[PDB]
């Protein structure tokens, strides 16, 4: 069975939604995986996004890796906002 790894971004700053400029940095899925394969999340191409109101900074993903075992993988990446 082939599997994939996908990415999701969240805001780490309560009350503040991610803007399109940050969402657009979401990496593409990693494809063609099989059970037994280790995966590492793709880095966002930029880790800092400046806005009129402040800065979004990429903190980290929730995991540094996952080894595929029967399911597709999701890595959740957190951005923090400072005004």
Author numbering: 1214 to 1296
From the paper:
The structure of single and tandem SHIRT domains from the streptococcal surface protein Sgo_0707 were determined. We call SasG, Rib, and Sgo_0707 “Periscope Proteins” due to their having variable-length stalk-like regions that define the distance that the N-terminal functional domain projects from the bacterial surface.
Based on the significant truncation of the N-terminal β-strand (Inset), we hypothesized that shifting the frame of the repeat by seven residues toward the N terminus of Sgo_0707 would complete the fold. The model confirms that SHIRT has an α/β fold organized around a single α-helix and two distinct β-sheets. We report the 3D structure of a SHIRT domain which, while also containing β-sheets, has a topology with no obvious relationship to the Ig fold.
